[PDB]
Write a protein that binds this ligand. Structure first.
Ligand SMILES: NC(=O)c1ccc[n+]([C@@H]2O[C@H](COP(=O)([O-])OP(=O)([O-])OC[C@H]3O[C@@H](n4cnc5c(N)[nH+]cnc54)[C@H](O)[C@@H]3O)[C@@H](O)[C@H]2O)c1
Ligand SMILES: NC(=O)c1ccc[n+]([C@@H]2O[C@H](COP(=O)([O-])OP(=O)([O-])OC[C@H]3O[C@@H](n4cnc5c(N)[nH+]cnc54)[C@H](O)[C@@H]3O)[C@@H](O)[C@H]2O)c1
Ligand SMILES: OCc1c(F)c(F)c(F)c(F)c1F
Ligand SMILES: OCc1c(F)c(F)c(F)c(F)c1F
Ligand SMILES: [Zn+2]
Ligand SMILES: [Zn+2]
Ligand SMILES: [Zn+2]
Ligand SMILES: [Zn+2]
Lengths: 374, 374
């Protein structure tokens, strides 16, 4: 029995940028008021976790990263009403406090209690529940899922179907929901439209799934790695193009292919140049372009505002625009009801102890999602 | 008496950038097939016309500028079906061909036959109807309203109510429609929202009118010329701010005043820095910013795409997003029914011969719209 007690468990600690994770024992404090301690069952490797390693994303180190996961509630703090010990849960890297101006807005999801904008790497109360070799370790996005056990604020956890397969539905914690919502909710892709998707990783494939679900007639996948094209076509891409095969800039190729510009474009990579290319390739009068990728910290892009004056719309979103705690349980229910598939995103299933091997598969281009199992 | 004949008349010819207009005789050819020759009655001075003088806006010179106007059809070429001699008309600087993919789209208005994106300074057929001193003179946006007579393509003219007061409704040909539509159609301002309007000239006042019509609860006018504030409050601003009064950047001031960002912001000036400031000041998760001002030719802005990733929407539009030929007669009918006011925009009236005085008024900061009478 662990409730009310410090847990000693295994976690993947990142002590400094550009080094492997260290798999070692940590101490996990019991949950305080309005906090939930979760035994992890499965976590995905998202490129955003790799951004912490590479320094593309700046967050306080040392840290327990991981934000795409599912597990089972081990214990609850005083005052928790929304989950109970034994419940299957997905941690929410975008919280839903329910009280801020964003949470009350019909179309906002980027709750003001988030730890993304200006990361502290703590619990809501400004402290950490993790120690390692006598040192305090930072949280990541209020989730920290690269651990056998984590502690999250109640506003950062959702209860899901007790019959959920956690090794699949962990992807609803980030990559599936982000891509699918970016198409269906943020862009609001229309029936019969032409879409261009830049980046055919886990998130870009989920964008394709959403564009197909919304009835797009043409879905053009764009990637510099042609090994990504077969799976993109399997989930709905009608064409794939590699910019490296062309003498012309790819915005010009895509404008020609679409007879004057695409209806909807998506940047799902994290590069400044592809964000401007993706905007430019949407039709100048009525096109919509959605930024999904995360680029290098503190870098500005350059663009000509005439691209917007003609009528284009440029937007971005976190987590597909979904209000996280309302949406995650519904997405799992929809998966259980066979409304979408997750298997196409899962290329590799490894034990947690092989986290570093899982990151190497991502960095080499081999994998889409590796699921780590505890 | 003039049908089929060259008309000699006075026009304001711009021979060189950064020089006064030259009021002098020009020859105006009769209309060819699907062309309309108009006797001008009234034309407004829009800041975009001044951009041609300043070189902010690049169009071939020498040119007859002017794009905000109203007149009476003198004659029609072969095959014209939509207007007749003696009809009151407004030239359409954004055409509506009715046949291209943008004209067919429910939300497009930037018709592919426009002469704004890559100006040629011609009729649709690539030729000019104007001669001066024996030399061909460019058209501007297919309209060229700074002339006693002009010739336009049929897709660039709308028939309006025969009882229209042309000295007022000329403003529907650019500044009113642009500002009003930018609020009501492009931004889709909501009841009870907070808006910020950068630039309180004729277009920005028209944006305020639209925000007030849409039911905004707060409309914050922003201008470095505090002389503009009284009229902004008359048409609906709840408060005005001058950036020069503050130690902190105005995006910070507006975020504070709106308890975390505005719902809707509008750039109605034409500066790269205020386009980025206006984006920044809208709420990071659900705010919308609309670019209305014309940027300086070929210059790029610099911005951090994290402004969009959180959830902001950035867009621009020409002519308030209105499909021009469908919309202009309806806007005139609504003016006739007192659904909106134009007199607040009109600060000065001059004869056409005093065009240069009218530009001096705009450049000094004194005027909103000067209306020139032929
Ligand atoms: N907005 C959100 O809420 C959110 C959520 C999840 C992921 N992300 C970001 O989304 C991006 C994609 O994540 P992911 O799918 O896990 O990554 P991934 O699996 O690494 O996929 C990226 C893809 O981009 C391809 N690529 C790289 N450079 C180019 C190029 N120049 N042109 C075209 N294709 C290129 C690459 O080959 C790969 O297939 C990353 O920047 C993540 O950080 C954002
Ligand atoms: N998108 C379109 O279809 C369309 C239509 C009409 C006009 N325009 C453009 O819209 C802009 C406004 O036109 P207008 O109302 O005729 O011009 P205007 O009357 O010159 O008004 C511009 C206002 O901006 C104010 N201003 C200047 N600099 C700053 C600053 N740094 N901060 C705040 N205020 C400042 C200035 O004092 C003035 O009151 C111009 O760039 C036009 O070219 C665009
Ligand atoms: O992949 C989701 C994700 C994001 F979209 C970010 F913007 C971010 F900063 C982050 F850490 C993250 F995990
Ligand atoms: O004022 C309307 C207007 C514009 F919005 C432009 F973008 C432009 F190029 C132009 F010449 C113009 F007159
Ligand atoms: Zn909230
Ligand atoms: Zn992620
Ligand atoms: Zn058209
Ligand atoms: Zn204008």
């Amino acid at each position: 029995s662990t409730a009310g007690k410090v847990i000693k468990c295994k976690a993947a600690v990142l002590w400094e940028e550009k080094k492997p994770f260290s798999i070692e024992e940590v101490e996990v404090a019991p949950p305080k008021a309005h906090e939930v301690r979760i035994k992890m069952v499965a976590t995905g490797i998202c490129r955003s976790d790799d951004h912490v390693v590479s320094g593309t994303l700046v967050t306080p180190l040392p840290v327990i990263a991981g934000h795409e996961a599912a597990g089972i509630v081990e214990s609850i703090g005083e005052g928790v009403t929304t989950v109970r010990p034994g419940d299957k849960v997905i941690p929410l890297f975008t919280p839903q406090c329910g009280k801020c101006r964003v949470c009350k807005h019909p179309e906002g999801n980027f709750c003001l209690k988030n730890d993304l904008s200006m990361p502290r790497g703590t619990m809501q109360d400004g402290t950490s529940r993790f120690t390692c070799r006598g040192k305090p370790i930072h949280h990541f996005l209020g989730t920290s899922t690269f651990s056998q056990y984590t502690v999250v604020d109640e506003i950062s956890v959702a209860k899901i179907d007790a019959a959920s397969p956690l090794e699949k539905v962990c992807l609803i914690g980030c990559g599936f929901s982000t891509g699918y919502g970016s198409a269906v909710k943020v862009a609001k892709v229309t029936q019969g439209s032409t879409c261009a998707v830049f980046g055919l990783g886990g998130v870009g494939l989920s964008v394709i799934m959403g564009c197909k679900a919304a009835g797009a007639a043409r879905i053009i996948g764009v990637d510099i790695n042609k090994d990504k094209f077969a799976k993109a076509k399997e989930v709905g891409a009608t064409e794939c193009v590699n910019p490296q095969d062309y003498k012309k800039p790819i915005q010009e190729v895509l404008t020609e292919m679409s007879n004057g510009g695409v209806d909807f474009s998506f940047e799902v990579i994290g590069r400044l140049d592809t964000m401007v290319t993706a905007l430019s390739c949407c039709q100048e009068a009525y096109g919509v372009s959605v930024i999904v990728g995360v680029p290098p910290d503190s870098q500005n892009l350059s663009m000509n505002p005439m691209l917007l004056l003609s009528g284009r719309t440029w937007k971005g979103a976190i987590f597909g625009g979904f209000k996280s705690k309302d949406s995650v349980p519904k997405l799992v229910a929809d998966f259980m009801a066979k409304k979408f598939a997750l298997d196409p995103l899962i290329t590799h299933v490894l034990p947690f102890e092989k986290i570093n091997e899982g990151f190497d598969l991502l960095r080499s281009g081999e994998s889409i999602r590796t699921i780590l199992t505890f």
